[PDB]
């Protein structure tokens, strides 16, 4: 029961259990909807100093309308973001354009989802959040160990999980201005991770309808900061 | 399907025309023969319609791809090579096409592929039914000194005298001009219209 | 859960922590940066005297423009190496030049993740750091039982990890002429491995972004020891 | 596709020209037909432009391959083994090349391939559509006790008097030099023009 | 853990190290290097006097030039010089000549490693050791039920490697004539295969480079004897 | 352990013992070589009257140039008798004729090899000897549910293994007339098989060099008897 | 042990066992040869009265010159009839003629053999006499689920193995007209089956040398009962 | 390439010649076209000699497995009838042989056997392209009453006949004698020459 | 190309010429016809240059894989058959050979196998384009009873009358003796211009 995917006797997949709290063990990241775009703010504890900063990065693009910040084990988060990248490279392929994110996000959480499925291996103990414009608009996902994907119009993943979550519960407005959402999710990385008193610069990403992507450089981010 | 594109100081001038025909009867007095593959990179396909747009699909998919996971744009010998082995791993049920890349990454260069594979770098190229009276009017007037303006000039004058002895090309122009200030950048109608009659020439 | 890669009853993967503890029981080895390049360097301790003492050789080449040297499981050592040596070779054959060293690692560390990820085989437990110029520049590498990657400036792996990663972390110097460089790293290797009361002479290598590789010879590292 | 290779005392002297035409058409004036495959040997190529640029490739990656896991170079009658067997896997679906080796080991080799993978050592070899003409110049000047100066005039020599003959060939002349002191070198282009200046010949 | 290829609580393969204890099991073999080549000596006891005396072969030869003798369980042992000897005849028919032996010890000892790798399958419970000349010129070979391989000067297998490692490791001469060589080799097996107090007449063979194989006769060991 | 193929705590593999237990409980059969050929008697204990006696065979021929009689389980033992059969047939079309015994007990001992190696099979619980003459003249082997094989002069297989081996290990001459050999033959399966204090007319086959195979008959072998 | 085939402590296959006591648990039938042919008789026991008597049939036809009746379980026996008719009717196609009936029981019992040998499968718990004339004259065989087969000129197979077999051992001569035949072989089946204290009409066939088969009706059976 | 073989009253009479020729020239003039392949059966082919000696081996290996666990000689009509199966799976790629078979298991049998399959038992049968000649001489004087020494001055009177109009047909003659008494019997070559000697023929 | 390859009491003489040519155009005027594929066996391959290579190498490498895992060497005949069956598995898509094989295991022999696999031993043979010279030649000359000398007296004799009438032959000739005493032992250089200045030829 407690090693495979099987049935528990009441009705609990164990393994896809054990995944949810290896994904409660990451790092934390999350993102929120503003007036007329998306943005995804990383914490990045940066921890030693031999560490290249700015080279390791967790807000990933997986196109130039779709990008992708992970949380939980590294490697099977870097695995799940190259078959997310060369899913939407397929529908670019074949249809000629990446009409909907909701798509590319229902792929991966199939691909989740058969090895929730299945004996002989493990499920993928990660957990993402997408963003990104399409033809209906602005667009903010989250997945889940199963394949459980929730639209929102903020959310979290990681270690700081439900601090944020109840600090986004309280205090988040729908339409907002680029600056101040920055601002608002800057403060909600806060509350939380301010319980080994510091935070450091996070890494932020944003785009707003009609333009590509744009990641800040160092020297921005610690303006709102 | 007239095709051609040099090199100057810093810059690659790539022009094509357009009109699609596949018989002595005109199907189309507009299409499309002169694309955009990466940030300082084009492509002229010229041949079979069919197999032109399909590997004009897979290779602004795989530039792309290229780009997003290395943060870096694919050098030009690499992009030719690349095309080279997609070209000649099918050779004996082959592509009828036969097409120009060019770009920019520290010095221009222009790359001229055959239908089974075979790459080479040379100065000018042109490719089509139109390609030998391209080759007669640049061996007689292209300079390596010449400037950005005289070049334009230059592709809009070698069009216009291959599409009046060539019954299968005609129609307007498109030009496109690569330089690694400005990006990949093509030129107006009304500006291709003001080079036509300031130079004397019709349609 | 102790025998094969499934989950834990909090996340952990046990097989893949037993390999981890695999690879503290080898022989140490670092690398580290330097002004305009990256060395290497191994301890070898050729402890019989009927041992090839030169033939040994863990600095081994995956192509005139990347290195690698490993610690662990030496057979699997072996042939992991030999597959990032076809692999360098397949990027040859396909693009015409290794333009990026963390493709190089990426893809090995994905072979690394697969035989974490599914039952009926084992992790490979070895670690292998990699070192060479590219395009971008010199980039020094580290991979883990699990897939894990990570670039440094200077870093280590071995018995002596965390005594080397202490002294590293102490004393290194970002930009620094290639004789100071070799004898910061030799330094390191001392502080460590003098607990044995000997250190040997060991093997070092080292590239200067534009040349080729140059493996030392023995008379050349018992001037820097 | 004119291509020349003879060998000497302890030097292999490997020349070519450069044009690649496939119709009563020059495509272009510049290409290339040797080629460096390891640290002390060469390789021409003469035939099909896209079969020929796959096996160099497939030669050079390895070769590279072998000399690093195995810290020695490979003998050149195992190069010439080796791609004997990679052409002849294929014979019913061929290649359409037609190339020479060289290289020295212990003594200078030159061997000679053809597209079934039928691989023959002699002393000197000639390729291509110019052939007949370089081994009409080399039956009556070779001596075996010529020095290096004398061959790189003679293979000069007789590739300007195969491109006054043949149509097909024409433009610059490759020369690389091999020898077990200095490795392979190839020879400047005024240093080429300087030959033919003093000996007397044209273009 | 016991019973398959899966790793320990702290870092050692069970099954492997049992196949090591099965060829301790084994009959004693050795061979060392001379001034021109190198000699194999296997202990040939034969045990009843029904056994074909000179027909049962544990050096047995893999071409003309590379030959082999083995320790263990000798159908693994039979099993795996046939492999040997069709990867020796690969590499005469596709580079035209034996360039390397040190290829052909690998090439075996990946085969070993794979076992060592999957479950479904034991290790190979054998250990060889290979000698001849190459290119490079004499070399001299050992290999493990890993797959680890070693180059020496001097070594043993079997149930006396331990006695004869070490009167090798005491008395050892670097460039030594083939008479003394083989005497050597001898009193090496003497010292340690005279606690049943006899040793019998050995097994010998030779090359010196240049030469072909030469496997001696019944009459000639005993004179050395 | 005990259950399938793998090793013991101390280099022992259980299902090929058990195997040879199994062939321990068969029947005796043995044979031997005199002056220019080689003899095979199985024991033939008839046990019922309602047995066909003639028509039940243990000694099985392969080809008119090589024989087998067996012992262990029968289903197992006509199963690789069958194979041996089909294999000599191979070497006739491939080469001309069958050159040498040794391969074709080789091939067989390779394929009782396998079983012994892989899991999800058990092993060969049968042994045979083989005999006949090849252009190197008489040849007697024997095989093992391992697939070791030997080369003997006289050999035994069976319930009477060790007391005929014992009488063999005494009272064997080399060179002998074919009269006194199957005498000397007769003598050995008495001493063991008068524990029931009977034998019973025994079959009996015999080649001398050159010429094909002989079985007696009912009546020749009472003469000896 | 006890629920897979593999080897006991000491050389027994515990599910081949358990498919012979399974084989004891049928339905008693047996066979003779006669003075120029054979006969087969199975009892036939119908239970209730609802039962289609004469359409359940065990002795069932192969070819019209080999016939089988079973005991066992009835499932197997009946896929493993149906296999042996379409291999009669294969060496039908191929050589033109059914010449040998002993060809058609090996193959059968080499197919109980292999269940017997692999993992993943149950043996067949099933056993089947086969009866008719070849080339060679009358043949009368049994088979074991174990796949081993015997030569008889009268056996027995069921829950009446023993008894039978016991007045057969006494009562049975060898030249014997075909109807003192049938005669002798039901009396064989009263004394065993008389322990119910009653027999029933039984199912019998016979064939004489040259002729077709002849399956008796209701009325001739009872002039013989 | 003449064969024939006839009956007579328990006895199979079987006789070649020996010379291979594929051309207007001969290549050798001492072959091997009469084979046995059991213990009282024969086999003659005449056709393609690569394919012919392989369906000979692939005969002998499986008649001597089915003697080995059978312990009775093959009938002659599954013999034919195995290799009428063997040459007709195989009827689109086949195989350009046309051979005999004769034997005794309780009757002397001829079987004659095409490239197709077609198998058809008669009393004498020639194959070959001195088969008409044959045909011819055995249509006038065969007779079944004939003792075993007629039948065997007959077959070489027949074979005499159709080397001397024949021009690919020539050599000493191979003839084997068939019967349950004596087994298979080939005849020495000093007895064929007394034969041809006493009934007035050369060579 | 022409080969020859006769038997004597306990010896066999084979030898060959040295002239690769596929046109009306001399390639190479020095190439190996003449191979050692065991202790006591040697090979004569002529027709398609890369096949014969191919073939050569596997049964070089077959050969004396049987030698060392058998101890004892391979019988001619069996040679001959295993060659048989490899080229007779794929005779719909053959290879352009003809070979001979000779040497000794207990009585001299010499097979000659065609591209389809039939083996017929005979007492000489000879395969190329010279060989109905060569066939002329020692249809008149040979004897049985002739001395090892003499033999490689009529060889030269032979391949040298070949030459002067085939235009596709010519060169050195290469010469290999084997015997049971002295193995397989090749004639040198010298010996054979003195062999050719002792009759009276030329070159």
Do not use: W
């Not at chain 1, 993102?31 to 080279?55: C, P, Y």
């Not at chain 2, 694309?35 to 530039?63: C, H, N, P, S």
């Not at chain 2, 019954?167 to 122009?173: D, E, Y």
Request: contains cysteine; hydrophobic residues 40%.
């Amino acid at each position: 029961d407690r090693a495979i995917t099987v049935f528990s006797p009441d009705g609990r997949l164990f393994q896809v259990e054990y995944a949810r709290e290896a994904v409660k063990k990451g790092s934390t990241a999350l993102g929120m909807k503003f007036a007329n775009g998306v943005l995804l703010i990383s914490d990045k504890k940066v921890r030693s100093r031999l560490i290249e900063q700015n080279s390791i990065e967790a807000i990933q693009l997986i196109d130039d309308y779709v990008a992708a910040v992970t949380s939980g084990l590294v490697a099977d988060a870097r695995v799940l973001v190259d078959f997310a990248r060369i899913s939407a490279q397929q529908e670019k392929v074949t249809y000629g354009s990446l009409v909907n994110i909701e798509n590319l996000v229902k792929r991966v959480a199939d691909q989740m989802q058969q090895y929730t499925q299945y004996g002989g291996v493990r499920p993928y103990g990660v957990s993402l959040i997408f963003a990104g414009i399409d033809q209906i608009g602005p667009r903010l996902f989250d997945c889940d160990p199963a394949g459980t994907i929730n639209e929102y119009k903020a959310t979290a993943i990681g270690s700081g999980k439900d601090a944020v979550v109840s600090f986004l519960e309280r205090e988040y407005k729908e339409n907002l201005p680029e600056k101040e959402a920055v601002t608002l999710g800057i403060k909600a990385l806060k509350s939380s991770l301010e319980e080994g008193e510091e935070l450091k610069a996070p890494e932020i990403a944003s785009i707003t309808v009609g333009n590509k992507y744009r990641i800040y450089d160092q020297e921005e981010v610690k303006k709102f900061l | 399907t007239t095709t051609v594109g040099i090199t100057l100081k810093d810059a690659v001038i790539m022009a094509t025309e357009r009109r699609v025909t596949m018989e002595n009867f005109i199907m189309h007095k507009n299409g499309k023969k002169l694309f955009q593959i990466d940030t300082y990179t084009g492509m002229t396909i010229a041949g079979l319609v069919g197999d032109a747009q399909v590997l004009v699909r897979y290779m602004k998919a795989e530039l792309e791809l290229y780009r997003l996971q290395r943060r870096v744009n694919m050098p030009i010998e690499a992009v030719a090579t690349l095309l080279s082995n997609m070209l000649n791993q099918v050779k004996y049920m082959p592509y009828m096409v036969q097409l120009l890349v060019g770009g920019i990454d520290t010095a221009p260069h222009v790359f001229s592929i055959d239908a089974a594979g075979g790459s080479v770098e040379d100065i000018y190229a042109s490719t089509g039914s139109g390609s030998p009276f391209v080759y007669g009017v640049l061996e007689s007037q292209y300079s390596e000194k010449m400037t950005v303006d005289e070049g334009v000039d230059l592709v809009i004058r070698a069009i216009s005298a291959a599409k009046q002895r060539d019954s299968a090309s005609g129609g307007m122009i498109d030009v496109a001009v690569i330089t690694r200030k400005d990006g990949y950048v093509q030129l107006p109608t009304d500006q291709i219209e003001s080079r036509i009659r300031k130079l004397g020439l019709i349609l």
